[PDB]
Amino acid sequence: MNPLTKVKLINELNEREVQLGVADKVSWHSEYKDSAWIFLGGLPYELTEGDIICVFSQYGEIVNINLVRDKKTGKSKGFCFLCYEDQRSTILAVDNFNGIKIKGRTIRVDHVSNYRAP
Amino acid sequence: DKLLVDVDESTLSPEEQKERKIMKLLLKIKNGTPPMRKAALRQITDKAREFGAGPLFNQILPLLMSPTLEDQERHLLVKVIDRILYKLDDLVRPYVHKILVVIEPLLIDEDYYARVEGREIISNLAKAAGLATMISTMRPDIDNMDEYVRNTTARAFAVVASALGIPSLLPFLKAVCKSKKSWQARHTGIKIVQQIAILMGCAILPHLRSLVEIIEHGLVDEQQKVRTISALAIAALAEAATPYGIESFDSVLKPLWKGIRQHRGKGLAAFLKAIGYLIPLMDAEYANYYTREVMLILIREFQSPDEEMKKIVLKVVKQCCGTDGVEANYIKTEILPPFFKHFWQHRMALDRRNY
Amino acid sequence: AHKKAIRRATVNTFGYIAKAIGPHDVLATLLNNLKVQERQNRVCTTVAIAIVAETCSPFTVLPALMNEYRVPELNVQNGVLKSLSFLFEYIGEMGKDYIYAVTPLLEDALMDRDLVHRQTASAVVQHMSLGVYGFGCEDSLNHLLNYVWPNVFETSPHVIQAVMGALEGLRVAIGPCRMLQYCLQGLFHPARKVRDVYWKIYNSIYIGSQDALIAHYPRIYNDDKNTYIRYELDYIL
Amino acid sequence: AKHHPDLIFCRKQAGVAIGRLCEKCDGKCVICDSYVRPCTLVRICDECNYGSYQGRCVICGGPGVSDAYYCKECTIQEKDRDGCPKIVNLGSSKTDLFYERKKYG
Amino acid sequence: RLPPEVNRILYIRNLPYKITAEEMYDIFGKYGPIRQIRVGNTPETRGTAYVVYEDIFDAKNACDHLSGFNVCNRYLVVLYYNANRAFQKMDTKKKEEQLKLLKEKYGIN
Amino acid sequence: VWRNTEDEILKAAVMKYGKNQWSRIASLLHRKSAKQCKARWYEWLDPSIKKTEWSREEEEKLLHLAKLMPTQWRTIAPIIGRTAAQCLEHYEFLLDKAA
Amino acid sequence: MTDRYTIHSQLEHLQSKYIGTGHADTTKWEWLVNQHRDSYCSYMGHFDLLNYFAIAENESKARVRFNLMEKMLQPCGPPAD
Amino acid sequence: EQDNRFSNKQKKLLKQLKFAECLEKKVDMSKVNLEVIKPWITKRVTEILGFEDDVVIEFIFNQLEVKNPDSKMMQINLTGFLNGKNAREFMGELWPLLLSAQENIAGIPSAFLEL
Amino acid sequence: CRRIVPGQFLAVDPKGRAVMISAIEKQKLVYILNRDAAARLTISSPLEAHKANTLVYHVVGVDVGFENPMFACLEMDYEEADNDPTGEAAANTQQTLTFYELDLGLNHVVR
RNA sequence: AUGAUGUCAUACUUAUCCUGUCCCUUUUUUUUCC
Ligand SMILES: [Zn+2]
Ligand SMILES: [Zn+2]
Ligand SMILES: [Zn+2]
Incomplete structure (x- = not known):
């Protein structure tokens, strides 16, 4: 199923969690106390790291960023990884940015378990 | 608005306009007490042929197009459209495409009863208007640009094929799937076949060979979306035609097993769903070899984060590693640890199906 | 109670206490139901009376019911008719004893002006004939069929469908030779409302017992260009 | 059933899979729509037992809880030989009651 | 920011009979450019008006503002139009030729 | 009703x-x-x-009164012997045939 | 109108489901021929009526069965129109 | 199949239709070569409908493939796409052409033999 | 002893896999018989071979080694002879032997 | 010795109702990088 449905997934997941009113320590985020890396997908093929960091600083400082562009033509592949300073910031970003429309392209945001350093 | 002003019926010399006036009893149907509803509904059922299609639909369909339709109002209007459809039998032939253009959304909607209604009435309309009418009318939607209508068409087609029996409609399909103008046509053809299998199920066995012939030509095509959707088709077929029919699929296996090693991302997910369903249809020896092969790839993907990746591997594990012809400790050692580490997470629970 | 399990259990308990004590006390109170709110029910009271009469053998109640049939109020006449229907369905084979008693009642219903009495009387005959299957009580079933038959021209779906049911019950209990003799003269009537009704009946027969009908068709004389008589049937030995 | 004439049955060839009824509907015959003297078992069409529908209330559509039987009458007149009695139309009643529900509460 | 039912097509009731189209063009004129205006003719339509702005924005402005206007001792009914059906074919001929004009005109293909 | x-x-x-x-x-x-x-x-x-049509004198009285005592129909209607409903609608009718 | 054509569809379908039922315009010919054909299948069925004919004539039960099944094709002369 | 309240529009149209004249000589396809015939059909329809319609083409082709095609059914099934009168025409010109190729020894029709 | 309800002709296929039971008109059924775990006998659900307007003079199984089972039933088709007001199609209508065949793969029965 | 049409209400029939349930709606510019 095409990825915008995979944004629908995470947003439904959040709202269901609030719907059952479940406590934060057992909130689905809790399984990643061990990661400051969050995946961005669906970025337009134009955004560079300047704009990405600028916008996503809104919840903290960024330790690292890796934007996978195709090396042969250098051009952005439209998805990236982001290492925030403190897990809580990534929780906030996953909550708030999952589904924002940038240049028409609705970007999807998520946790990352085992970020691979390339 | 007409009902606001008043004028005498004789002065309403356009006796068809008289008909329209009295037809705006529709409002009584829409809003009104239960007795108003019942009396109006009888009125219209029995004066149906007296009224005739043209007026009826020309004054119904605008309603159904209303943005401000609530639920009751809608199901009421579909009730009527159904009853008048049962009276006017042929007279609808000019009005089919209109009827679909409005009903189609009921096919894709989160209400359950709305889906079942819309589906049933398209069946009835397909039975009423003759096949050739349906075909000729809703062909041009196959190619239509906006995917919304392509998708909803494919679903409708599957319904009508259930109504009028596959072997009738099969040649039209064969044409569509091997269309050459643009590939969206082919994609929608293959989608039709998927939805048939999903809907009718085991009523398919006597045609399984013909279907698979229709659809496999997309298994190898260089376009990417057609390959994925084709694999999903094959998987739907199999899950319907459980244990049987494997001699008909035999032609298609190798391309599956070819693509499975060397695909990445999406195509991998699809081809995995297909081979998953195929395995039980196989015979314990052929299948045991095939199995122990696939479980290699399978292992590799438990840790993938992509959602449908996870879901597909769930269902597959169920089938392959739930087969009669496998062994305890193999599973116990190589499958169980990663399975329970990865899949038992609170994010799963909060989802509905994954549960 | 707007639920059905409740009403169900209620009726079953009425049976139980009838067994506990004795039919007469409970039957008298149950009969005192004119209970205007007709369905949602006094109907369930009808079922209750049936179970009463069944559990303590209907010697006892049948005179009480046939008595109540006099009280000139409509819904209670119809109450006794329904209760009869259920009675015979429930007790089954034992009707071979009470059918002689009951008939002159049913006669009285089948010969009166309104559809509710005819529709409910026809249900009774259906069940009764299905219970008496094979016991030799056919003369009275045949007489009840003679009163039932004329309603066959009717319009209100509930009565037309009750009548058709009754007719197929009577088919299994009288034989198809009888129903065929009743159904002949109108297979080819000049009307078309009748020809509709008659061919509907004659199908409902022919579907069942289309084998028995072999030795029953009338003998039909052959014309110039065909041969309509079966001679193999009178090969004399 | 005998009560809503707008209802339809599958009417294909019977099979070997027995039929089951919801706890809600249970206790009755399927056709004569009575509540007594169960004699013989129901059997259903292959399709009407395919798929998720393994073990569903023939009538109510819900969960299978018990077996479905035939009254003595229906088996005496052999109405029990018409194949799947599986009702392949949901019917107006369930729809309308659910809709009025969603409206009210 | 627009509720997508808003349109440059407005539907107006409670119209004084035999008002001057001049008067009316002014009324709706303070709001924006008028692509066109039509009034009913038959006694049923006589007194109702379909008014078409050339811009969705002046459209919404008007519909929200003049709504309930007191003209000639009566309040004016305004509404958004549901242009949900059609009454004629689209004239393949003229469409095709004007598009041929466009294609050869800007040498596209 | x-x-x-x-x-x-x-x-x-x-x-x-x-x-x-x-x-x-x-x-x-x-x-x-x-x-x-x-x-x-x-x-x-x-x-x-009293269920009949209005005399000329009755309508004279009605009109005159409803001019004398604005909108008080339960005060008037006894004076001309009809109900408030009769007086009301019938005065409406006279007013409409006049205009 | 509606009555005639819905009952017409119901009678045509019920008939194509059960060979030999009738409908309000069944003609003498079809009635009589369905009634023969059923007599024939039933003679071949009941093991005994076969003995009766195979003794009344002097043929043997195989030849008798064969002649019955020969006739079941057009037993009451050729059709009427 | 399931319902007897809706009328089989096959039988209905087969009754009330106006057919062509020579559609009754049975025709098999084994006696025939096809890929000779096709371009005739191609150009013919491309003219009638004034553009190219791959799905209509393949529709006729697949209709033609079984050992015995039904000219009545193919007439009907085309009536939708064509003018309806153009249907009976196009039939009244094909069906004999199949007759020609089928009486031929090679399986090839006569007008395309002269051509 | 009905006309279209099976039971008269009975045939079986030599290697034991399938029995077919046929009426004198319009209906034929096929059941498959398979030994179970305890090697007790087990019977499938019926397949179907209906074909309108067709008498059947005799049905018999054909012997093939463990392939699809075939039953080979004499026949005749009276449908057109019904509509020959002249009386021709009563003659010049000769009976057609027609091998039906089970299809173990697809689980149905094809002529 | 009553026709039909009637936005004419009241009776009346159906052991019909009044709890059943939402599970394959997931649809789009391939895109989770050693
Ligand atoms: Zn029953
Ligand atoms: Zn079934
Ligand atoms: Zn149930």
């Missing part, structure tokens, strides 16, 4: 029971309230309600 059957039952009930116990009366018909029975009886049913 009222249907002729409820109407007749009202006539009989009143002539039996007297004008003073409307509770018993309204208890009789379903979907009818004691207040409504009282109102209907005094408004339409009771025999003293």
